[PDB]
Design an enzyme around this catalytic site. Structure first.
Site, mmCIF file in Angstrom:
data_model
loop_
_atom_site.group_PDB
_atom_site.id
_atom_site.type_symbol
_atom_site.label_atom_id
_atom_site.label_comp_id
_atom_site.label_asym_id
_atom_site.label_seq_id
_atom_site.Cartn_x
_atom_site.Cartn_y
_atom_site.Cartn_z
ATOM 1 N N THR B 335 0.823 -1.206 0.000
ATOM 2 C CA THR B 335 0.000 0.000 0.000
ATOM 3 C C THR B 335 0.858 1.257 0.000
ATOM 4 O OG1 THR B 335 -1.784 -1.155 1.169
ATOM 5 C CG2 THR B 335 -1.750 1.246 1.307
ATOM 6 N N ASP B 388 -6.813 -0.289 -3.527
ATOM 7 C CA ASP B 388 -5.920 -0.859 -2.533
ATOM 8 C C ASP B 388 -6.516 -2.091 -1.879
ATOM 9 O OD1 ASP B 388 -3.508 -0.626 -0.723
ATOM 10 O OD2 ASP B 388 -5.149 -0.580 0.734
ATOM 11 N N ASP B 389 -5.678 -3.123 -1.719
ATOM 12 C CA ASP B 389 -5.974 -4.341 -0.961
ATOM 13 C C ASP B 389 -7.200 -5.059 -1.535
ATOM 14 O OD1 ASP B 389 -5.670 -6.352 0.846
ATOM 15 O OD2 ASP B 389 -5.928 -5.131 2.644
ATOM 16 N N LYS B 416 -10.857 -2.671 -17.467
ATOM 17 C CA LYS B 416 -10.789 -2.584 -18.910
ATOM 18 C C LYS B 416 -11.745 -1.550 -19.477
ATOM 19 C CE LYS B 416 -11.800 -6.866 -19.390
ATOM 20 N NZ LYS B 416 -11.702 -7.258 -17.964
ATOM 21 N N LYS B 493 6.697 -3.746 6.970
ATOM 22 C CA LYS B 493 5.758 -3.318 8.000
ATOM 23 C C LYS B 493 5.887 -4.173 9.245
ATOM 24 C CE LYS B 493 0.890 -2.220 8.765
ATOM 25 N NZ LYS B 493 -0.454 -2.154 8.126
HETATM 26 N N1 ATP Z 1 10.680 0.931 1.459
HETATM 27 C C1 ATP Z 1 9.431 0.826 1.960
HETATM 28 N N2 ATP Z 1 8.427 0.307 1.229
HETATM 29 C C2 ATP Z 1 7.186 0.201 1.722
HETATM 30 N N3 ATP Z 1 6.835 0.593 2.956
HETATM 31 C C3 ATP Z 1 7.745 1.134 3.791
HETATM 32 C C4 ATP Z 1 9.124 1.282 3.327
HETATM 33 N N4 ATP Z 1 9.817 1.832 4.331
HETATM 34 C C5 ATP Z 1 8.955 2.018 5.352
HETATM 35 N N5 ATP Z 1 7.721 1.603 5.031
HETATM 36 C C6 ATP Z 1 6.552 1.666 5.924
HETATM 37 O O1 ATP Z 1 5.920 0.396 5.972
HETATM 38 C C7 ATP Z 1 4.526 0.580 6.191
HETATM 39 C C8 ATP Z 1 3.743 -0.432 5.379
HETATM 40 O O2 ATP Z 1 2.460 0.080 5.061
HETATM 41 P P1 ATP Z 1 1.554 -0.772 4.063
HETATM 42 O O3 ATP Z 1 0.106 -0.589 4.418
HETATM 43 O O4 ATP Z 1 2.049 -0.493 2.674
HETATM 44 O O5 ATP Z 1 1.943 -2.278 4.434
HETATM 45 P P2 ATP Z 1 1.248 -3.449 3.595
HETATM 46 O O6 ATP Z 1 2.321 -4.429 3.210
HETATM 47 O O7 ATP Z 1 0.374 -2.831 2.540
HETATM 48 O O8 ATP Z 1 0.303 -4.166 4.669
HETATM 49 P P3 ATP Z 1 -0.855 -5.134 4.140
HETATM 50 O O9 ATP Z 1 -0.138 -6.011 3.154
HETATM 51 O O10 ATP Z 1 -1.303 -5.842 5.391
HETATM 52 O O11 ATP Z 1 -1.888 -4.215 3.544
HETATM 53 C C9 ATP Z 1 4.202 1.996 5.767
HETATM 54 O O12 ATP Z 1 3.673 2.685 6.895
HETATM 55 C C10 ATP Z 1 5.518 2.622 5.390
HETATM 56 O O13 ATP Z 1 5.661 3.888 6.030
HETATM 57 N N1 ATP Z 2 -7.521 -7.206 -36.680
HETATM 58 C C1 ATP Z 2 -7.868 -6.762 -35.454
HETATM 59 N N2 ATP Z 2 -8.827 -7.371 -34.741
HETATM 60 C C2 ATP Z 2 -9.180 -6.943 -33.522
HETATM 61 N N3 ATP Z 2 -8.623 -5.891 -32.909
HETATM 62 C C3 ATP Z 2 -7.648 -5.186 -33.508
HETATM 63 C C4 ATP Z 2 -7.205 -5.599 -34.841
HETATM 64 N N4 ATP Z 2 -6.244 -4.742 -35.199
HETATM 65 C C5 ATP Z 2 -6.076 -3.864 -34.180
HETATM 66 N N5 ATP Z 2 -6.918 -4.132 -33.176
HETATM 67 C C6 ATP Z 2 -7.020 -3.388 -31.907
HETATM 68 O O1 ATP Z 2 -6.982 -4.324 -30.839
HETATM 69 C C7 ATP Z 2 -7.880 -3.945 -29.801
HETATM 70 C C8 ATP Z 2 -8.641 -5.171 -29.327
HETATM 71 O O2 ATP Z 2 -9.303 -4.938 -28.095
HETATM 72 P P1 ATP Z 2 -10.424 -5.988 -27.644
HETATM 73 O O3 ATP Z 2 -11.032 -5.570 -26.335
HETATM 74 O O4 ATP Z 2 -11.294 -6.253 -28.842
HETATM 75 O O5 ATP Z 2 -9.612 -7.325 -27.327
HETATM 76 P P2 ATP Z 2 -10.431 -8.508 -26.622
HETATM 77 O O6 ATP Z 2 -9.773 -9.817 -26.980
HETATM 78 O O7 ATP Z 2 -11.896 -8.312 -26.895
HETATM 79 O O8 ATP Z 2 -10.173 -8.231 -25.070
HETATM 80 P P3 ATP Z 2 -11.271 -8.772 -24.046
HETATM 81 O O9 ATP Z 2 -11.613 -10.122 -24.609
HETATM 82 O O10 ATP Z 2 -10.531 -8.807 -22.734
HETATM 83 O O11 ATP Z 2 -12.376 -7.749 -24.139
HETATM 84 C C9 ATP Z 2 -8.796 -2.888 -30.376
HETATM 85 O O12 ATP Z 2 -8.542 -1.661 -29.700
HETATM 86 C C10 ATP Z 2 -8.358 -2.692 -31.802
HETATM 87 O O13 ATP Z 2 -8.190 -1.299 -32.047
#
Ligand code: ATP
Ligand code: ATP
Ligand code: ATP
Ligand code: ATP
Lengths: 520, 520
Positions: B335, B388-389, B416, B493
């Site tokens: 987080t 988050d989470d 998406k 943490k």
């Molecule tokens: N390098 C670092 N990266 C991340 N957090 C750090 C770092 N250094 C210190 N911290 C501290 O660690 C704490 C972790 O907070 P955080 O909520 O991100 O933990 P978390 O892993 O998300 O917990 P949970 O997974 O249970 O949600 C923060 O308060 C932050 O200030």
């Molecule tokens: N020949 C093609 N057929 C399909 N999409 C194409 C082609 N050429 C380029 N594209 C681009 O690829 C993108 C396809 O996005 P699309 O959401 O259709 O993929 P998807 O497989 O449907 O993903 P999801 O199944 O998660 O919705 C479009 O933005 C389109 O502009």
């Protein structure tokens, strides 16, 4: 004749033969061996088709000279108890001709307007405080018993048709209920000719505007939808080459009456009148983001099976309903190929039933919304419906598998529900989990499937990258020295991820950044 | 030439082309080149952008002299049944120019100040005794047949656009549905130039006050959010001048003058913390409680792969929606790295969708509060929502693993769902369960993931302990002997839990306690 009514000749010459047909020519014949005349006319329709324009015109073409126009809820708002008295004070000026007769298109009309404000009680005691029923059967009984007038015509209209009382729909009371739908291709060259007739200018608008060019690509939207197309462009012509320099402290007419040009209309349908239906611009361009590149032969093999199955829908009578299913791996570009088939199909009504306009809805609120889309595809002659991403309408998740049964059994029906006879519906479906639908027998529901693969070989990966054109020829060569002969299997949408994460690195490092991300 | 409206040069000149191009300009070519005048404007918007400003100003730049200003629920007042007495006396004085003064002035306006509490028309009449189904079509049918040229011009505005009845927004009645959003960088030195125009020592406040420098760092929040900046900055400059404990008014100005400094504006950027659109450290520092120390390359690899992926969101237009999923073990500081990636990104809109503000919500209320957060992202040019989470929004628990299906299906869609044309979004996800989100088909939906690890070596543990600065150099030497040899595995943490639980021992036993709890 009549004042301008476009594309309603199979309706206005159909309320010729129910109301207009008597009362002028056969009073020497009905006096011999006749019967009672018509009693009242009802007018269906989605808003914008020209219901009210009839009652302004049939109140004037009849030469009746008493158009007793009432509004819908104009009655109700008196003191409690005495509400029902207005409508029986409305027929009473007509009711004095219980004793007389006449000639030249008999002359009392009553015109309600969105009649399902008063005329509730569809059978479900709709309302309270004891007035929602008493103003219905006061009106049920002023036009049957005792007999009267034989010269009134209760011309009613509404937007929500099937909520009026069924005792008020029988031919004793409202003889003809009539569907006024949106005009077709033939009807829209009628109505453009009307609202561009009082326009004279040089010659009737201009020299360049072809209303036939405005007939076919203004392709589905209704009457007042189409009146707004003309009214916006001649309003843009009120800011063009004679008033393009108004500069709010205005000028007078100095540059002397610019004709409404062709550039006016195709700027007005560009911005900002959406057809509100929504046809030929539903913003399907949100789904086709980066165009349709033909990165391989299996793109051409899909969309030709579009038109080899779209033309099944246009020219059949054995199969009124064709339901196809696009399938394949995720990120393979199915939603785009469902839209690109439907957009190139040139049907009037193209509605993309995508679940992103349905987020947070329950099992019931999706079925009530999918009912509205498929009823809007039953009101058309030719219509296509993209039922996009089946496994999100069915709120599916493979943990102990849970899904909506209520949406599924209201979708397995709607893949096999025929439209009204003579109408054609094309259902395109996208899914990433074929073998989930193999369990639910929805593959049994669709007519045929079309497999949309990923990019297959290293030649297609370059061919997908030549057409996007993001990499230098020397930079393309390094990727050409990798995948040519290797086995890559990745979608086209996922390929747009990996190209665009690659470009945000250093310019000499944009190649193997792509080759690192391609490995997974 | 016109009284103040800031940054709406496009929208105000787009109702020039609708309710201002006709009806005034030629003024005799209209009846020659026949055209009805438009019947009104609809004003969308987020709250506080100048919707009601475009009623008061448009009711004074028309020289129309009688705006029939109604309020939102003003009409509904009387006993049940009696409600429509107001919405037909509303048009009544303008109906009375259906006289010998048929055309030719023309006294127009009716302002629906909040229309969405009137017009719903939900199609299934789900409402007792006529709440929102007979005030609607009394309104729908007093502006149609029979009608004049005619007189009126109905301007309705709403915070909520689509819940208005779709029958009423046809081009007959309310043509333009105009989008009034929050303004860009150049629209704000219009509105700062408006409200600080009358603000003066001579014609402006001071010399160090430059609005064009405050235009670019008051970047996201809207117009009414910005007039509150100007009003509460001179409010700060009141107490800078006057003294206020009791009823004391004693000056009789002490410096014999008064001006507002640049330090008085940015004193009120600690208040007005860019409300509802944008943050300037808007108390999301409760997610970073102890800073982000960099104990090694597996932190620098995390917060640069964030800021490379921020550059993908900012610069690119191929992929206008980029998503990431910060993953790893629990208690790994996930987080805190997500807020730091967002804080180092300088986006306008940084809202953190978090389960800690959603305690005790049911399955429906978790979707709609998650939907409210992304709809505020969709009303900005740039945005970054930290979901988050994940496994607490999904209220997951793995005993026969139960979760909210409806939240997951309102989350796999929004990862998406594309924002409207030209707008961006950066969704950042934190989760502790990579494998469970694979089982739900959600790692399919994210673009890429960053494994945020635990500290794995004794060197990274000693480096993490130096930067906090807790123990003593001889005490760390005892730690440096023991944490080497064997390899440890603990989050950042959880490391902050143990250090504070070890300082509270006896000072001769702090180190030999911290090396005991770290054995597991
Ligand atoms: N390098 C670092 N990266 C991340 N957090 C750090 C770092 N250094 C210190 N911290 C501290 O660690 C704490 C972790 O907070 P955080 O909520 O991100 O933990 P978390 O892993 O998300 O917990 P949970 O997974 O249970 O949600 C923060 O308060 C932050 O200030
Ligand atoms: N020949 C093609 N057929 C399909 N999409 C194409 C082609 N050429 C380029 N594209 C681009 O690829 C993108 C396809 O996005 P699309 O959401 O259709 O993929 P998807 O497989 O449907 O993903 P999801 O199944 O998660 O919705 C479009 O933005 C389109 O502009
Ligand atoms: N077939 C048509 N021919 C000519 N004009 C039409 C036609 N249909 C609609 N119009 C235009 O539509 C406008 C009003 O139509 P109307 O008020 O009947 O819409 P409606 O939704 O059917 O009625 P209501 O709004 O009362 O339900 C008129 O200005 C008319 O010019
Ligand atoms: N573009 C602008 N230029 C100048 N002032 C503005 C602008 N936008 C908003 N304001 C200020 O916002 C205040 C009112 O804002 P606004 O009209 O948006 O309220 P509102 O959201 O319409 O309220 P409601 O919708 O309930 O009527 C006024 O004091 C006005 O000065």
């Amino acid at each position: 004749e009549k004042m301008g009514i476009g594309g309603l000749d199979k309706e206005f010459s159909d309320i010729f033969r129910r109301a207009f047909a008597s009362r002028v020519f056969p009073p020497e014949i009905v006096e011999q061996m006749g019967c009672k005349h018509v009693k009242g006319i009802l007018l269906y329709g989605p808003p914008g088709c020209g219901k009210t324009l009839l009652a302004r015109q049939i109140g004037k073409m009849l030469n009746a000279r008493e158009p007793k126009v009432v509004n819908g809820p104009e009655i109700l708002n008196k003191y409690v108890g005495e509400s029902e008295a207005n409508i029986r004070k409305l027929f009473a000026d007509a009711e004095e001709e219980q004793r007389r007769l006449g000639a030249n298109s008999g002359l009392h009309i009553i015109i309600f307007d969105e009649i399902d404000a008063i005329c509730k009680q569809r059978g479900s005691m709709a309302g309270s405080t004891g007035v929602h029923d008493t103003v219905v059967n006061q009106l049920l009984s002023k036009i049957d018993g005792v007999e009267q007038l034989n010269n009134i015509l209760v011309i009613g209209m509404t937007n929500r048709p099937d909520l009026i009382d069924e005792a008020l729909l029988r031919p004793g009371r409202l003889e003809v209920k009539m569907e006024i739908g949106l005009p077709d291709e033939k009807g829209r060259l009628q109505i453009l000719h009307i609202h561009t007739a009082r326009m004279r200018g040089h010659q009737l608008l201009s020299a360049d505007v072809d209303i036939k060019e405005l007939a076919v690509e203004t392709k589905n939207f209704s009457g007042a939808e189409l009146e707004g197309l003309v009214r916006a462009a001649q309003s843009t012509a009120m800011n063009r080459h004679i008033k393009a320099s108004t500069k709010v402290e205005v000028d007078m007419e100095k540059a002397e009456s610019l004709q409404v040009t062709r550039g006016d209309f195709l700027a007005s349908l560009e911005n900002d009148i959406k057809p509100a239906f929504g046809t030929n611009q539903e913003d399907y361009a949100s789904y086709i983001m980066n165009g349709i590149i033909k990165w391989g032969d299996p793109v051409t093999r899909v969309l030709d099976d579009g038109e080899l199955l779209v033309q099944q829908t246009k020219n059949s009578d054995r199969t009124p309903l064709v339901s196809v299913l696009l399938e394949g791996p995720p990120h393979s570009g199915k939603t785009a190929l469902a839209a690109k088939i439907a957009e190139e199909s040139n049907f009037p009504f193209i509605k993309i039933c995508s679940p992103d306009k349905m987020i947070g809805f329950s099992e019931t609120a999706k079925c009530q919304a999918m009912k509205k889309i498929f009823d809007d595809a039953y009101k058309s002659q030719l219509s296509c419906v993209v039922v996009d991403d089946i496994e999100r309408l069915l709120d599916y998740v493979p943990i102990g598998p849970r899904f909506s049964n209520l949406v599924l059994q209201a979708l397995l029906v709607l893949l096999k529900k025929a439209p009204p006879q003579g109408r054609k519906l094309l259902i395109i479906g996208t899914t990433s989990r074929k073998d989930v639908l193999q369990e639910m027998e929805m593959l049994n529901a669709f007519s045929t499937t079309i497999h949309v693969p990923n990019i297959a070989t290293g030649e297609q990966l370059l061919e997908a990258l030549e057409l996007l054109g993001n990499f230098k020829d020397k930079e393309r060569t390094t990727i050409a020295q990798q995948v040519k002969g290797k086995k890559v299997w990745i979608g086209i949408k996922k390929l747009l991820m990996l190209i665009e994460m690659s470009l945000q690195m250093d310019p000499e490092y944009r190649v193997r950044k792509f080759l690192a991300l391609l490995r997974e």
